[PDB]
Design a protein around this ligand. Structure first.
Ligand code: WTA
Ligand code: CAC
Ligand code: CAC
Ligand code: CAC
Ligand code: CL
Ligand code: CL
Ligand code: CL
Ligand code: CL
Ligand code: CL
Ligand code: CL
Ligand code: CL
Length: 653
């Protein structure tokens, strides 16, 4: 009864078919004939300077430590370029087709960027990187940009010449930006003078200057290219253009890449330690991101697509730039926020550009729900037919609101589960063919074999089951390693021979539908952003008066999960609102606003530790959630902390 059937119109329009059988027939084929399946997709849908030698052997891999090093290769011996598949090959047939319907935060700032215009922008920038900054195949380029056309231009210019990009979310502090540039050893930083988020100025160049001063004090010598959106080492993009020759505006050769040449680095939070650079290569990621974009959203050439994610996250890589452009999509590119000038903004964009596919996140949805349906009903949503959710679980009422108010009830919802490490969608509905259970990711994508591993015995559980979500077989979009640390990669994701461990928990029901329960490690999902507890603790501890801290998640009604901080101060410290405010500001300096603690509790007699000195985080998880029952607390070094924490927490309410 908790099932919503797809719309008949989406069934008639589906690339797959009108019935679930149409999807299952394809899926079983993608599993029984994995090589042939991906060989047909890659050959039908992409351009190759050179094709893999044998369609029988389009992949090789090892998911078992005990047999040797973990590895995965797709389309070995193939040669291609991501920029060529995203731009050049669409020309001249789709020269005048709109790539990005761009709007700034200021609604009077708009720009309809065609694929032809993207080409000019990319070759110009690519020639600047080549002949003015000496960017070569393999060189790392950092991006610190807002959601403007230049951000996609920069990712494709680097891809055109073989450069490895690393995108730093424009909301990260200077220290956060500095750390990522150093670890990637970037030759160049591309940024913009500033951006806007409502009425708040986002001066990006000034932050970047603080990051660069820090890198230069550490020995580095990083160049900076600055686009004018609203100066040492620092060159304005206009000055660089003025140095280009007329032919350098027209033409730039494509650097043809091998299947496993690196495409980008993306720093991702983990259960322990600082964020690590996840490494994605060329051929496999290209095929998987574009193929998932096509089927998970049933994109057709007459659709208009709008993803609200930032390029600084994997969602923006795969489903704002790389994926959509490779399938010659017409997309909306929005620099601003959903509540400026008011909360109708996204719906004004939907009718203005006749959007038919909208890809957003539960946190944004729940924010829109707090503002009133009237902010939605003033815009025309008759063109919407597919709605997408990503980043974290979506509750039933939010799912129903999205489809019924947002989509006027004539939409299919694709709640897609996946990760930075998976490259693209892994469990997702497909419009027209997949029955929907509100809150469920439903069925695995073509060529994906998920499993539920028993938490204690680490065996696969048949039929309905709850446990650890794992992937028992490789897929083209899988991350290949961690930058300069394959051992950490093997330990983190392949501790169970034969499986990729996702770090999520999930339940599978009697129809084979998957329900993702959230992280099972020390990783938080705060406002759809992935953040680790260890790095928040390290930031909290940098405050001169903080001795020790412990960070746990706890339930929140908009962000899903909030950040709860237990901390002890230096002796003789007067705890005041200002002090606690200065500690919040310390996290925002070290990391950024996305990691702002929500609650800060003083462990008045200390943090709960075992006799051996290990913090008992389960006790902190239970206290922050108000569960005072499931706590033996006598193995503690100081058992009296429990009543201190329960009391101080109730005093805070
Ligand atoms: C794409 C973002 O990738 P990341 O930023 O690397 O976060 C990845 C992490 O977000 C969570 N997650 C993502 N999608 C969903 C979903 N549909 N339902 C429930 N949880 C989800 C999950 O915990 C995962 O492991
Ligand atoms: C190796 As085959 C032809 O069964 O995909
Ligand atoms: C993706 As089509 C060729 O059916 O518009
Ligand atoms: C929630 As976002 C627009 O920073 O991906
Ligand atoms: Cl059906
Ligand atoms: Cl059928
Ligand atoms: Cl196989
Ligand atoms: Cl080889
Ligand atoms: Cl069930
Ligand atoms: Cl803020
Ligand atoms: Cl102690």
């Amino acid at each position: 009864s908790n099932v919503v059937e797809p719309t008949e119109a989406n069934g008639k329009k589906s690339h797959v078919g009108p019935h679930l059988g149409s999807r299952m027939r394809i899926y079983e084929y993608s599993i029984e004939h994995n090589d042939a399946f991906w060989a047909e997709i890659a050959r039908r849908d992409f351009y190759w300077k050179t094709t893999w030698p044998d369609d029988q052997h389009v992949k090789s891999y090892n998911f078992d430590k005990s047999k040797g090093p973990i590895f995965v290769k797709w389309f070995e011996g193939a040669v291609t370029n991501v920029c060529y598949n995203a731009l050049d090959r669409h020309l001249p047939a789709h020269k005048d087709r709109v790539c990005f319907y761009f709007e700034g935060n200021d609604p009077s700032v708009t720009e309809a960027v065609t694929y032809g215009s993207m080409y000019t922008r990319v070759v110009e920038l690519a020639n600047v990187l080549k002949y003015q900054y000496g960017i070569a195949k393999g060189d790392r380029v950092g991006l610190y940009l807002p959601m403007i056309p230049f951000a996609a231009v920069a990712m494709l210019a680097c891809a055109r010449i073989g450069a490895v990009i690393t995108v730093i979310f424009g909301g990260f502090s200077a220290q956060a930006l500095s750390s990522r540039l150093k670890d990637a050893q970037t030759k160049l930083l591309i940024t913009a003078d500033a951006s806007a988020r409502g009425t708040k100025p986002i001066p990006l160049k000034d932050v970047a200057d603080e990051a660069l001063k820090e890198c230069e004090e550490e020995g580095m010598s990083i160049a900076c290219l600055v686009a004018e959106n609203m100066m040492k080492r620092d060159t304005w993009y206009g000055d660089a253009l003025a140095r280009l020759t007329p032919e350098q505006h027209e033409e730039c050769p494509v650097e043809w890449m091998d299947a496993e040449d690196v495409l980008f680095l993306l720093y991702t939070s983990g259960s322990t330690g600082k964020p690590k650079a996840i490494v994605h290569t060329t051929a496999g990621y290209m095929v998987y991101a574009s193929t998932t974009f096509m089927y998970s959203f049933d994109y057709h050439m007459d659709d208009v697509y709008f993803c609200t994610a930032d390029i600084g996250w994997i969602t923006g890589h795969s489903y704002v730039v790389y994926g959509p452009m490779i399938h010659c999509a017409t997309s909306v590119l929005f620099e601003g926020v959903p509540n400026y000038p008011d909360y109708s903004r996204w719906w004004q964009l939907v009718e203005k550009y006749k959007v038919s596919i909208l890809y957003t996140a539960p946190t944004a949805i729940r924010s829109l729900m707090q503002a009133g349906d009237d902010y939605v009903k003033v815009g025309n949503r008759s063109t919407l037919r597919v709605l997408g959710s990503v980043g974290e679980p979506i509750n039933v009422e939010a799912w129903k609101w999205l489809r019924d108010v947002g989509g006027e009830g004539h939409c299919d919802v694709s709640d897609t589960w996946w990760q930075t490490e998976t490259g693209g969608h892994m469990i997702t509905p497909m419009p027209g063919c997949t029955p929907m259970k509100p809150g469920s990711a439903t069925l695995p994508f073509f060529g994906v074999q998920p499993v539920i591993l028993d938490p204690m015995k680490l065996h696969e559980k048949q039929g309905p089951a709850e446990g650890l979500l794992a992937i028992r077989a490789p897929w083209p979009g899988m991350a290949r390693t961690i930058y300069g640390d394959h051992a950490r990669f093997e330990k983190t994701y392949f501790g169970v021979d034969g499986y990729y461990m996702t770090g999520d928990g999930a339940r599978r029901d009697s129809d084979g539908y998957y329900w993702i329960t959230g992280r099972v490690d020390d990783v938080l999902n705060v406002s759809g952003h992935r953040i680790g507890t260890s790095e928040i603790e390290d930031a909290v501890n940098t405050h001169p008066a903080v001795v020790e801290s412990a960070v746990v998640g706890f339930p929140h009604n908009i962000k899903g999960e909030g950040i709860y901080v237990f901390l002890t101060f230096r002796q003789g410290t007067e705890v005041t609102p200002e002090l606690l405010a200065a500690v919040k500001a310390t996290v925002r300096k070290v990391i950024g606003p996305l990691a702002t603690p929500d609650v800060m509790q003083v462990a008045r007699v200390g943090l709960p530790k075992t006799r051996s000195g290990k913090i008992v985080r389960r006790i902190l998880r239970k206290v922050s959630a108000g569960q005072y029952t499931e706590l033996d607390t006598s193995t503690l070094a100081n058992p009296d902390v429990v009543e201190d924490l329960i009391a101080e927490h109730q005093r805070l309410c």
